[PDB]
């Protein structure tokens, strides 16, 4: 009824599910690191549109 | 039942001199 | 308890390595095992002749 | 095991009702896309190449 | 064609509709018993509309609707192959049933469990129907052992009665050995033909028959109880009645016949297994006959005769007229 | 594959965190999420695997393992409450924080691009395991049981270590794309044979291999509920996971080396389903059912077809909810009448009529009943397996006999028959149980509408 | 193999070529895990006497964590300079020695004949 | 116009003419009417209303096109890059030719049910198709293994090839 | 006795307190949490929305393109007189066979 026994007994939901979103933003954070082909592979290779600098990021 | 645990007789194995 | 005991636990520590104990080891453990190998080793050394020289119809033989 | 088949029922209706419902309105009022060819000079995006409403979404959003 | 194809999914889909109410849709334990009788008698009707069909302009046709899996050059598909076949036997299928059920609420009417036996009765009446419509080898294999696990269900009924668990699983155990035979049917269609379709099994016709035949034959034996995997017939009397009375002897035993009977354009080419079946049925028809003539328990006596009926069918097989053990299949 | 090492890792400071008679409905709620996000790993490409980094990809071998782990974490949690209900909150606690860093090293060995990385991590499994095993084990023999379990694997796998380092050595590359197109043939030579027993033999004893396999009734008794599911379901796919990879640089070695695992394997097999026949523990029945459908696994690996390696696939996802589901309905019977004895408690369906329901459905699924996905993948493997050799064909139907047999035969000693008389205590199935074995049938069942998403990578 | 290497400096933690080297970032992954043991150390220290594992003495967790930091930097730095030397070395020994190291005649898979092993 | 005829070849069909001789109503033609008015309308109405709904709403998907790339055989040896995006076109171009294979075994099928007992001859033409393609298909991508890739179909490319020019240089030799 | 040990304890039957209880804890009020986070999450979201996503997976596999490629390719080459599927994968003017 009272965060003094609601806020502490109930923070603990956000461990996980934070975990994620860390998790999620780690995992785009790798791939700006892996960019040294983006638009330069044989196959998907072409110009960049009127808007628009990288193909993915 | 209870879990096993280790009695005087088990244990004595390893109170010797040697194994 | 004392049924399933003797079916389970109390076997080895009754068991000696003697002449009936290993002949029906080897006869029932090693047996099949040989026998089954010559089988299937003479039967695809057979058909991998076969298909070498051409001589096995695989015409519409495409899942594998 | 009657009350536990009841507690099944109801949580297997309590969101798979609504996802019933929601796709029957998807297939209704939004429907399938149509192949077409790609126009000159038209790059779609990776989830324009997928025909079902929701198999776009999915491809757009997490894919 | 759009009567007939509507017409022929509908019957099946209506036998399904009393087992899917099961989950708590619309309940009412008084009349499910009379419920399920009552979808037998509609179902009936309808497959009539397509059986009068063939019988005016010989109307055949296959129901590919669903594609199920595609294993590289392999696409499997829920295919129901409505023919000469099929149109003939759901009729007498759903004719016996609807008697069947009908009897069962008289004879089970003090069965606590009443309710379950109807739907373990219907269960078996869906299995068979996807049996005798199986387009491709894979399909009729889900029929093949659906039949098999609900006759186990049925026979050891009475759970308390050591000698009718034995019963059932004795059934289960000689319908498997009989499965080898299909599952090396199978096995040799996928590696020379590339298909499980009964379609493409035809057409590319094979002359060298003796395996994927052998294999069926063994698969007949098994199901239909010829010799040599006969004595769980007998043993299958330990359920209630109008189990012995619609799977036993009327409609799950003809699965080894209607086996041979859905190949019998290879077997016909094939003078080798003629010979073998021929002579597997006429022991067949000769031995369980004899058995009969000194029984004393009526229903078993009406096993060995069943027993015997099926040598018959066996031996119309082996004389190259699989239309006429059809023919007796339903009659 | 931080998306999911993460939150995992979180699981720790919630269950720590977390009020003292909160452990059990945070856990398993939270463990419940991650499952669901699991699903997100299906994107995949005909042609190219997922690749997120230089250290995890997921292929379509991985994913279906994945999915599987990741989902048996809030089964094992359901399955350990009741005994565990009266033990001491920080031993509680240390239970669960086993089970955790048990999911987190299993779904990196999964996805390790690296063998040696995989390596660590298969290796790594086998502490929070043993653990498991001798501490909150029941019995005196749970001792006897992790030195078997700890020498077995370890005995196997040291050998593979030197063999991966020599494999780096020679090649320049652990990494499993670059084995794709750097690979090389093996010479059939002395030193390649014994290559190829040290990359295999580390895989033949986590199967395991018939011979081989005598830590398996120990480890898989002696163990708790919680740790029998995570062995039989995923732990014994360590073994057929890694040697789906390491067969591609053991090419064209395996066509003679794979002789003598061949015939243990399908001899195997029908030695220990005939051991079912005769077993007087429930539990033990069980573990023997494992090693026989190891059996077919070990040899749709080593024929190395495209049919061959879809059945494995399907064979050990469908193998691991089946295991699991047979251990947990053992286990329910073993909370009220405490003991594994399968003859001492009968008529069980007399008393616990939906439970027998259960038992019904994995007995079905146990004995390949189609179109279930064990019938599936057992089928693939058999038509591989006959264009191998067509004889194959009489050990392979002589097998699924004698698994009809015992599985029913399991069905009817303990749901048929007349009760005990002098067992008055068989109270009526909890929600917790019932909802145990739902969440086992369930995704079982479902994965026969759209079986292709536990085909592999060749589908 | 690196002990006599002709870089007159021994004896020196990092010697002063080292500095043309980037340092390690402060968020670097390694010096974060460093930095996270000394939390553990923290932690079990409080429990082998019988604290209050999370809350007691946070002046003594932080210097736990500040000293496995500090350490850890400078272990990083030394680190990574080993391998720069490393790589130095190799391609320095490779550009004096061209002959053990040629330049392979480039061949096409269309080119080159590998024996087919068939699974069957 | 739902799928192209040309891919999926049908014969014209032809329908005989009715030509009663019997004076008794034929039951089919009076249930015909009715599944014509009791089902057929329905359902036509139903459709028509959801067919509307999707022309207010209307939006298209593409064909995804892939610009062929160096083969194997022009990647030089232990290049991954190259290898790389030439092995993915081949596990594309393995995809298509299954497919492929699908059609033809289709065509195949679907003429054995409609000629009926005709079937063993005026199928002859798709009988033969389906000889064809399968043994293209067998001769390119059978017998590689579970571990198959473009490099090991090269080989085996390779292999048949020397054969075939030995073979026919052995019996020029005669 | 040959030490001090206590007395094996009796089993606990959650029945006999809480007639209501679903067998997850002793504690009605987190018995009854810990039953609706497992239906909830279990069945609700992980079995049926994953059910859902997994049916509308975008083209799992890309199988679904491969048949519409080979449609096009069956169309091209039978317009064409070209052979439906050739037995050889790779242009043989590329392959240079030894001697
Ligand atoms: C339970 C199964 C799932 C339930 C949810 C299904 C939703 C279906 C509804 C829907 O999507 O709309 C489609 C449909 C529209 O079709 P559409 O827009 O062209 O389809 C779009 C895509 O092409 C096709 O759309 P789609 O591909 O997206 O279809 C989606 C659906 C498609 O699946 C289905 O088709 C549902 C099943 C129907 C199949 C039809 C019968 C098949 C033949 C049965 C017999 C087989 C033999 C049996 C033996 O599949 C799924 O729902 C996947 C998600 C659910 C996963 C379920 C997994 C567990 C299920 C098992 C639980 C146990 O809805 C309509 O509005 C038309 C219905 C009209 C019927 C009646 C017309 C006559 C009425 C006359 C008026 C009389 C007035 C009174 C006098
Ligand atoms: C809130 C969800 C309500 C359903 C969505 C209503 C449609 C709104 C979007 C309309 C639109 O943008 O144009 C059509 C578009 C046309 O496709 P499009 O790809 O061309 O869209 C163009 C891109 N945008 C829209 C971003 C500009 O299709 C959709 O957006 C529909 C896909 C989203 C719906 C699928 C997700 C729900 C899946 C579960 C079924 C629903 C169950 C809901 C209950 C859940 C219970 C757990
Ligand atoms: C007090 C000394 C006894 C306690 C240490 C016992 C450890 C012995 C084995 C490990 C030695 C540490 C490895 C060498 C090293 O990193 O330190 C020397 C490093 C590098 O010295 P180095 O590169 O010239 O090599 C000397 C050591 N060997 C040959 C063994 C490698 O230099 C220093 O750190 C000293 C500078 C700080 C002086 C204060
Ligand atoms: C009985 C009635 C059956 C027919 C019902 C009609 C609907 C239907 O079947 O089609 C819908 C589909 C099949 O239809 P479909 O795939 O042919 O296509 C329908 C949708 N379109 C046409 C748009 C593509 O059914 C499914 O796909 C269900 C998938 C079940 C997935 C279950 C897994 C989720 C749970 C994961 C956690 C558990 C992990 C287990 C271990 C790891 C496994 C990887
Ligand atoms: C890297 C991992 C470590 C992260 C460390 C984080 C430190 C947090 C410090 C304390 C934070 C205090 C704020 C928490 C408020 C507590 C309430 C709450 O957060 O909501 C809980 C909610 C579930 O609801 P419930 O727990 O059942 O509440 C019942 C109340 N009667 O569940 C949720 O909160 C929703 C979970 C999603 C929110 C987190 C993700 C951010 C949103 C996406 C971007
Ligand atoms: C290979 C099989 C070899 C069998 C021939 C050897 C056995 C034999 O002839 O007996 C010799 C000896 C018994 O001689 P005896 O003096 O009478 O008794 C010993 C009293 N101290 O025997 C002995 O005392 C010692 C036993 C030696 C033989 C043990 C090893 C034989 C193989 C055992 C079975 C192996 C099964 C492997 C299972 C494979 C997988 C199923
Ligand atoms: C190999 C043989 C053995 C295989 C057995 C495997 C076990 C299966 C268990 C039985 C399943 C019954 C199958 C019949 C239901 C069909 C389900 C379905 O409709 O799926 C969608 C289907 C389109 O599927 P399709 O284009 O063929 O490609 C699918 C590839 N995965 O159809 C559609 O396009 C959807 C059209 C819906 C129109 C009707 C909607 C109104 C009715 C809604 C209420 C009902
Ligand atoms: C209980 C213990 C369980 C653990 C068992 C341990 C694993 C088994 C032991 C490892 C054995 C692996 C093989 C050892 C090296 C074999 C020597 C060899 O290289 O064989 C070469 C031969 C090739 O001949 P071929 O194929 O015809 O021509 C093409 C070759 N380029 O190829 C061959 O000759 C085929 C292989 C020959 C061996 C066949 C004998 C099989 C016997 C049944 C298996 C019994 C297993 C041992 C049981 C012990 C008890
Ligand atoms: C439970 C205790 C343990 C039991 C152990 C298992 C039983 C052991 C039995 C003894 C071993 C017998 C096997 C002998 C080796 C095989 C020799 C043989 O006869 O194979 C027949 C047939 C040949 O096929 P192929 O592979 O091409 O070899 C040709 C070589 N000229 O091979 C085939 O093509 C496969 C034919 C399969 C036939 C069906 C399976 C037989 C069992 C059927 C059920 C019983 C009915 C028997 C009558 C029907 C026989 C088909
Ligand atoms: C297990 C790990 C145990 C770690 C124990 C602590 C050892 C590391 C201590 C590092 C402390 C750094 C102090 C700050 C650096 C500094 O300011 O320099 C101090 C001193 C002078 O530096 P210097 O290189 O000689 O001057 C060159 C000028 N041109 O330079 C120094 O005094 C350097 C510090 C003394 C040397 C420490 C030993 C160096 C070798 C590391 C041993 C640990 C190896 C761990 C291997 C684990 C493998 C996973
Ligand atoms: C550096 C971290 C400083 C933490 C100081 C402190 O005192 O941390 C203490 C608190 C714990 O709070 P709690 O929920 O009462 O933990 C125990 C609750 N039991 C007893 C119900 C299980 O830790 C946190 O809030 C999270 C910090 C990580
Ligand atoms: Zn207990």
Same mark, same amino acid.
């Given at each position: 009824?009272?965060?003094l026994?609601?806020?502490?007994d109930?923070?603990?939901?956000?461990?996980?599910?934070?975990?994620?979103?860390?998790?999620?933003?780690?995992?785009?954070?790798?791939?700006e690191?892996?960019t040294?082909?983006?638009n330069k592979?044989?196959?998907?290779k072409?110009?960049?549109?009127?808007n628009?600098?990288?193909?993915?990021? | 039942?209870?879990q096993?645990?280790?009695d005087?007789?088990?244990?004595?194995?390893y109170?010797?001199?040697?194994? | 308890?004392?049924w399933?005991?003797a079916?389970?636990?109390?076997?080895?520590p009754?068991?000696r390595?003697?002449?009936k104990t290993?002949?029906?080891?080897?006869l029932?453990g090693?047996?099949?095992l040989?026998?089954?190998?010559?089988?299937?080793?003479?039967?695809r050394?057979?058909?991998?002749?076969?298909?070498q020289?051409?001589?096995?119809?695989?015409?519409?033989?495409i899942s594998? | 095991?009657?009350?536990?088949?009841?507690?099944?029922?109801?949580?297997?209706?309590?969101?798979?009702?609504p996802?019933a419902?929601?796709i029957?309105?998807?297939n209704?009022?939004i429907?399938?896309?149509?192949?077409?060819e790609?126009?000159?000079?038209?790059?779609?995006?990776?989830w324009?190449?997928?025909?079902?409403?929701?198999?776009?979404?999915?491809?757009?959003?997490?894919? | 064609?759009?009567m007939?194809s509507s017409?022929?999914?509908?019957?099946?889909?209506?036998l399904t509709?009393?087992?899917?109410?099961?989950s708590?849709?619309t309940?009412?334990?008084?009349?499910?018993?009379?419920?399920?009788k009552?979808?037998?008698?509609?179902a009936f009707?309808?497959?009539?509309?397509?059986?009068?069909?063939?019988?005016?302009?010989?109307?055949?046709?296959?129901?590919?609707?669903?594609?199920?899996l595609?294993?590289?050059?392999?696409?499997?598909?829920?295919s129901?192959?409505?023919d000469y076949?099929?149109m003939?036997?759901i009729?007498?299928?759903?004719?016996?049933?609807?008697?069947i059920?009908?009897?069962?609420?008289?004879y089970?009417?003090?069965?606590?469990?009443?309710?379950?036996?109807?739907?373990?009765?219907?269960?078996?009446?869906?299995?068979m129907?996807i049996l005798?419509?199986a387009?491709?080898?894979?399909?009729?294999?889900?029929?093949?052992?659906?039949v098999?696990?609900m006759?186990?269900?049925?026979?050891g009924?009475?759970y308390?009665?050591?000698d009718?668990?034995?019963?059932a699983?004795?059934?289960?155990?000689?319908?498997?050995?009989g499965?080898?035979?299909?599952?090396?049917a199978?096995?040799?269609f996928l590696?020379?033909?590339?298909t499980?379709?009964?379609?493409?099994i035809?057409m590319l016709?094979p002359?060298?028959?003796?395996?994927?035949?052998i294999?069926?034959?063994?698969?007949?034996?098994g199901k239909?109880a010829?010799?040599?995997?006969?004595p769980?017939?007998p043993?299958?009397m330990?359920?209630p009645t109008?189990?012995?009375?619609?799977?036993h002897?009327?409609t799950?035993?003809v699965?080894?016949?209607?086996?041979?009977?859905?190949?019998?354009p290879?077997?016909?080419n094939?003078?080798?297994?003629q010979?073998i079946?021929?002579?597997?049925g006429?022991?067949?028809?000769?031995?369980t006959?004899?058995?009969?003539?000194?029984?004393?328990?009526?229903?078993?006596?009406i096993?060995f005769?069943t027993?015997?009926?099926?040598?018959?069918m066996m031996?119309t097989?082996?004389?190259?007229?699989?239309?006429?053990?059809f023919l007796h299949?339903?009659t | 594959?931080?998306?999911?090492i993460?939150p995992?890792?979180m699981?720790?400071?919630?269950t720590?965190?977390?009020?003292?008679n909160?452990?059990?409905?945070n856990?398993?709620?939270?463990?419940?999420?991650?499952?669901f996000?699991?699903?997100?790993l299906?994107?995949?490409?005909?042609d190219?695997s997922?690749?997120?980094?230089?250290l995890?990809f997921?292929?379509?071998?991985?994913?279906?393992?994945?999915i599987?782990?990741?989902?048996?974490?809030?089964?094992?949690?359901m399955?350990?409450?009741?005994?565990?209900?009266?033990?001491?909150?920080?031993? /509680?606690?240390?239970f669960?924080?086993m089970?955790?860093?048990?999911?987190?090293?299993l779904?990196?060995?999964?996805?390790?691009?690296?063998?040696?990385?995989?390596?660590?991590?298969?290796?790594?499994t086998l502490?929070?395991?043993?653990?498991?095993?001798?501490?909150?084990g029941?019995?005196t023999?749970?001792?006897?049981?992790?030195?078997?379990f700890?020498?077995?694997?370890?005995?196997?796998s040291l050998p593979?270590?030197?063999?991966?380092?020599?494999?780096?050595?020679?090649?320049?590359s652990?990494?499993?794309?670059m084995?794709?197109?750097?690979?090389?043939?093996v010479?059939?030579?002395?030193?390649?044979?014994?290559?190829?027993?040290?990359?295999?033999?580390a895989?033949?004893?986590?199967?395991?291999? =018939?011979?081989?396999?005598?830590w398996?009734?120990?480890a898989?008794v002696?163990?708790?509920?919680?740790?029998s599911?995570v062995?039989?379901?995923?732990?014994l796919k360590?073994?057929?996971?890694?040697?789906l990879?390491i067969?591609?640089?053991?090419?064209?070695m395996?066509?003679?080396?794979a002789?003598?695992?061949?015939?243990?394997?399908?001899?195997?097999?029908?030695?220990?389903?005939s051991?079912?026949l005769?077993?007087?523990?429930?539990?033990?029945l069980?573990a023997?059912?494992?090693?026989?459908?190891?059996?077919?696994?070990?040899?749709?690996?080593?024929?190395?077809?495209?049919?061959?390696?879809?059945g494995?696939?399907?064979?050990?996802i469908?193998?691991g909810?089946?295991?699991?589901?047979?251990?947990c309905?053992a286990?329910?019977?073993?909370?009220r009448i405490?003991?594994?004895?399968?003859?001492?408690?009968?008529?069980?369906?007399?008393?616990?009529?939906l439970?027998?329901?259960?038992?019904?459905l994995?007995?079905?699924?146990?004995l390949?009943?189609?179109?279930?996905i064990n019938?599936?993948g057992?089928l693939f493997?058999?038509?591989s397996?006959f264009s191998?050799?067509?004889?194959?064909?009489?050990?392979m139907?002589?097998?699924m006999?004698?698994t009809?047999?015992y599985?029913?035969?399991?069905?009817?000693?303990?749901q048929?028959g007349?009760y005990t008389?002098?067992?008055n205590?068989?109270s009526?199935?909890?929600?917790?149980?019932?909802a145990?074995?739902?969440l086992?049938?369930l995704?079982?069942?479902?994965?026969?509408?759209?079986?292709?998403?536990?085909?592999?990578?060749?589908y | 193999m690196?002990?006599?290497?002709?870089?007159?400096?021994?004896?020196?933690?990092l010697?002063?070529e080292?500095?043309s080297?980037?340092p390690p970032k402060?968020?670097?992954?390694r010096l974060?895990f460093?930095?996270?043991l000394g939390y553990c150390?923290?932690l079990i220290?409080?429990a082998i006497?019988?604290?209050?594992?999370?809350?007691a003495?946070?002046?003594?967790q932080?210097?736990?964590?500040?000293?496995?930091?500090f350490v850890g930097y400078?272990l990083?730095k030394?680190?990574?300079?080993? =391998?720069?030397?490393?790589?130095?070395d190799?391609?320095?020994?490779?550009?004096?020695?061209?002959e053990?190291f040629p330049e392979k005649?480039? /061949?096409?898979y269309?080119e080159?004949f590998?024996?087919?092993h068939?699974?069957? | 116009?739902?799928?192209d005829?040309?891919?999926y070849?049908?014969?014209?069909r032809?329908?005989?003419?009715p030509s009663?001789?019997?004076?008794?109503?034929?039951?089919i033609?009076?249930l015909?009417?009715?599944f014509?008015?009791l089902?057929?309308?329905?359902?036509?109405?139903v459709?028509?209303?959801?067919?509307?709904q999707?022309?207010?709403?209307?939006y298209?998907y593409?064909?995804?096109?892939?610009r062929?790339?160096?083969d194997i055989?022009?990647?030089?040896e232990?290049?991954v890059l190259c290898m790389?995006?030439?092995?993915?076109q081949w596990?594309?171009?393995?995809?298509?030719d299954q497919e492929?294979?699908?059609?033809?075994?289709?065509?195949?099928?679907?003429?054995?049910?409609?000629?009926?007992?005709?079937?063993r001859?005026?199928?002859?033409?798709?009988?033969?198709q389906?000889?064809?393609?399968?043994?293209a298909?067998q001769?390119?991508?059978?017998?590689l293994?579970?571990?198959?890739?473009?490099?090991?179909?090269?080989?085996?490319? /390779?292999?048949?090839?020397?054969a075939?020019?030995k073979?026919?240089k052995?019996?020029?030799?005669? | 006795?040959?030490?001090?040990?206590?007395?094996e304890?009796?089993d606990?039957?959650?029945?006999?307190?809480?007639?209501?209880?679903?067998?997850?804890?002793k504690?009605?009020?987190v018995?009854?949490?810990?039953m609706?986070?497992?239906?909830?999450?279990?069945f609700?979201?992980?079995?049926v929305?994953?059910?859902?996503?997994?049916? =509308?997976l975008?083209?799992?596999?890309?199988?679904?393109?491969?048949?519409?490629?080979?449609?096009?390719?069956?169309?091209?080459?039978?317009?064409?007189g070209?052979?439906?599927?050739?037995?050889?994968?790779?242009?043989?003017?590329?392959?240079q066979?030894?001697?």
């Amino acid at each position: 009824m009272n965060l003094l026994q609601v806020v502490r007994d109930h923070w603990v939901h956000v461990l996980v599910p934070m975990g994620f979103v860390f998790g999620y933003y780690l995992d785009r954070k790798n791939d700006e690191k892996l960019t040294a082909f983006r638009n330069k592979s044989l196959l998907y290779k072409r110009e960049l549109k009127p808007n628009e600098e990288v193909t993915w990021k | 039942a209870r879990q096993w645990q280790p009695d005087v007789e088990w244990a004595e194995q390893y109170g010797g001199a040697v194994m | 308890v004392r049924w399933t005991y003797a079916r389970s636990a109390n076997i080895y520590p009754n068991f000696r390595p003697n002449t009936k104990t290993s002949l029906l080891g080897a006869l029932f453990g090693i047996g099949p095992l040989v026998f089954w190998y010559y089988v299937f080793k003479t039967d695809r050394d057979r058909k991998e002749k076969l298909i070498q020289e051409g001589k096995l119809d695989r015409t519409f033989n495409i899942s594998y | 095991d009657k009350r536990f088949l009841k507690l099944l029922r109801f949580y297997i209706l309590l969101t798979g009702i609504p996802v019933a419902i929601g796709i029957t309105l998807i297939n209704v009022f939004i429907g399938e896309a149509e192949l077409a060819e790609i126009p000159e000079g038209y790059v779609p995006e990776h989830w324009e190449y997928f025909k079902h409403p929701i198999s776009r979404w999915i491809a757009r959003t997490f894919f | 064609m759009n009567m007939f194809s509507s017409l022929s999914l509908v019957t099946l889909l209506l036998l399904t509709m009393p087992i899917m109410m099961m989950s708590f849709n619309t309940y009412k334990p008084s009349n499910y018993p009379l419920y399920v009788k009552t979808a037998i008698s509609y179902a009936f009707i309808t497959s009539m509309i397509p059986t009068m069909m063939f019988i005016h302009s010989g109307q055949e046709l296959i129901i590919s609707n669903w594609h199920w899996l595609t294993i590289q050059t392999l696409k499997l598909s829920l295919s129901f192959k409505m023919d000469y076949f099929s149109m003939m036997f759901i009729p007498v299928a759903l004719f016996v049933t609807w008697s069947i059920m009908e009897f069962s609420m008289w004879y089970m009417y003090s069965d606590p469990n009443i309710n379950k036996f109807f739907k373990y009765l219907l269960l078996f009446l869906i299995t068979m129907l996807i049996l005798v419509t199986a387009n491709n080898l894979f399909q009729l294999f889900i029929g093949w052992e659906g039949v098999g696990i609900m006759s186990f269900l049925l026979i050891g009924w009475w759970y308390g009665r050591a000698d009718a668990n034995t019963a059932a699983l004795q059934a289960i155990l000689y319908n498997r050995i009989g499965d080898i035979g299909f599952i090396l049917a199978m096995a040799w269609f996928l590696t020379n033909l590339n298909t499980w379709d009964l379609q493409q099994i035809f057409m590319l016709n094979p002359s060298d028959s003796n395996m994927p035949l052998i294999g069926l034959a063994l698969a007949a034996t098994g199901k239909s109880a010829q010799f040599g995997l006969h004595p769980w017939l007998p043993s299958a009397m330990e359920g209630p009645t109008p189990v012995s009375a619609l799977l036993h002897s009327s409609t799950m035993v003809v699965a080894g016949i209607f086996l041979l009977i859905r190949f019998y354009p290879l077997t016909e080419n094939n003078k080798y297994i003629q010979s073998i079946t021929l002579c597997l049925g006429a022991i067949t028809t000769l031995f369980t006959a004899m058995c009969a003539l000194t029984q004393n328990d009526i229903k078993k006596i009406i096993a060995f005769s069943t027993s015997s009926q099926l040598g018959l069918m066996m031996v119309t097989i082996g004389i190259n007229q699989p239309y006429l053990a059809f023919l007796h299949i339903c009659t | 594959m931080l998306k999911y090492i993460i939150p995992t890792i979180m699981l720790m400071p919630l269950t720590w965190l977390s009020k003292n008679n909160m452990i059990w409905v945070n856990s398993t709620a939270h463990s419940l999420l991650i499952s669901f996000t699991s699903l997100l790993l299906m994107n995949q490409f005909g042609d190219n695997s997922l690749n997120f980094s230089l250290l995890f990809f997921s292929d379509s071998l991985s994913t279906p393992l994945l999915i599987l782990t990741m989902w048996l974490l809030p089964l094992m949690l359901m399955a350990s409450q009741h005994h565990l209900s009266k033990e001491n909150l920080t031993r /509680k606690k240390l239970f669960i924080t086993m089970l955790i860093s048990l999911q987190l090293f299993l779904i990196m060995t999964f996805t390790a691009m690296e063998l040696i990385l995989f390596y660590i991590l298969f290796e790594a499994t086998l502490v929070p395991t043993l653990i498991i095993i001798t501490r909150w084990g029941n019995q005196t023999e749970r001792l006897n049981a992790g030195l078997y379990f700890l020498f077995y694997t370890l005995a196997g796998s040291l050998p593979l270590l030197v063999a991966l380092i020599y494999i780096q050595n020679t090649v320049g590359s652990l990494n499993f794309l670059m084995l794709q197109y750097w690979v090389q043939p093996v010479h059939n030579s002395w030193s390649n044979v014994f290559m190829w027993l040290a990359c295999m033999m580390a895989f033949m004893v986590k199967m395991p291999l =018939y011979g081989l396999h005598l830590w398996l009734p120990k480890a898989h008794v002696e163990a708790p509920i919680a740790g029998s599911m995570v062995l039989a379901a995923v732990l014994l796919k360590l073994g057929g996971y890694g040697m789906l990879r390491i067969t591609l640089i053991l090419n064209p070695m395996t066509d003679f080396m794979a002789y003598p695992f061949i015939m243990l394997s399908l001899w195997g097999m029908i030695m220990t389903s005939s051991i079912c026949l005769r077993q007087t523990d429930l539990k033990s029945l069980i573990a023997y059912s494992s090693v026989s459908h190891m059996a077919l696994v070990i040899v749709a690996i080593l024929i190395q077809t495209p049919w061959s390696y879809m059945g494995a696939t399907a064979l050990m996802i469908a193998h691991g909810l089946t295991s699991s589901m047979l251990f947990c309905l053992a286990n329910s019977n073993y909370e009220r009448i405490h003991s594994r004895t399968m003859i001492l408690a009968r008529g069980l369906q007399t008393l616990l009529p939906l439970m027998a329901t259960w038992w019904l459905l994995a007995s079905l699924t146990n004995l390949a009943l189609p179109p279930t996905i064990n019938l599936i993948g057992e089928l693939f493997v058999v038509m591989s397996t006959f264009s191998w050799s067509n004889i194959t064909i009489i050990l392979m139907g002589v097998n699924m006999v004698i698994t009809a047999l015992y599985s029913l035969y399991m069905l009817i000693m303990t749901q048929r028959g007349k009760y005990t008389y002098h067992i008055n205590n068989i109270s009526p199935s909890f929600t917790r149980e019932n909802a145990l074995m739902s969440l086992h049938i369930l995704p079982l069942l479902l994965l026969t509408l759209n079986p292709k998403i536990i085909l592999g990578p060749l589908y | 193999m690196m002990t006599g290497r002709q870089g007159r400096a021994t004896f020196q933690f990092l010697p002063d070529e080292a500095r043309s080297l980037p340092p390690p970032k402060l968020t670097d992954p390694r010096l974060a895990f460093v930095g996270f043991l000394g939390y553990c150390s923290g932690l079990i220290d409080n429990a082998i006497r019988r604290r209050p594992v999370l809350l007691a003495g946070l002046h003594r967790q932080l210097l736990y964590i500040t000293s496995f930091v500090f350490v850890g930097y400078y272990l990083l730095k030394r680190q990574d300079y080993m =391998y720069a030397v490393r790589d130095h070395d190799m391609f320095s020994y490779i550009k004096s020695h061209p002959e053990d190291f040629p330049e392979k005649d480039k /061949k096409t898979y269309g080119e080159v004949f590998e024996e087919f092993h068939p699974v069957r | 116009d739902s799928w192209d005829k040309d891919v999926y070849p049908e014969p014209p069909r032809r329908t005989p003419a009715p030509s009663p001789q019997t004076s008794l109503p034929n039951p089919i033609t009076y249930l015909t009417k009715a599944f014509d008015l009791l089902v057929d309308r329905p359902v036509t109405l139903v459709r028509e209303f959801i067919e509307r709904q999707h022309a207010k709403n209307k939006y298209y998907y593409y064909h995804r096109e892939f610009r062929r790339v160096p083969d194997i055989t022009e990647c030089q040896e232990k290049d991954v890059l190259c290898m790389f995006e030439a092995e993915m076109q081949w596990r594309r171009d393995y995809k298509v030719d299954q497919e492929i294979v699908n059609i033809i075994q289709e065509r195949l099928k679907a003429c054995q049910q409609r000629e009926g007992e005709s079937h063993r001859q005026n199928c002859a033409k798709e009988l033969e198709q389906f000889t064809q393609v399968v043994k293209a298909y067998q001769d390119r991508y059978h017998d590689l293994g579970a571990h198959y890739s473009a490099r090991k179909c090269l080989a085996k490319q /390779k292999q048949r090839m020397l054969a075939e020019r030995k073979a026919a240089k052995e019996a020029a030799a005669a | 006795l040959r030490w001090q040990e206590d007395p094996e304890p009796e089993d606990e039957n959650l029945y006999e307190k809480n007639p209501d209880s679903h067998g997850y804890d002793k504690d009605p009020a987190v018995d009854i949490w810990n039953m609706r986070v497992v239906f909830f999450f279990g069945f609700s979201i992980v079995l049926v929305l994953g059910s859902t996503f997994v049916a =509308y997976l975008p083209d799992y596999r890309m199988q679904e393109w491969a048949r519409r490629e080979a449609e096009r390719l069956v169309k091209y080459r039978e317009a064409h007189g070209l052979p439906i599927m050739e037995s050889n994968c790779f242009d043989p003017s590329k392959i240079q066979l030894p001697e």
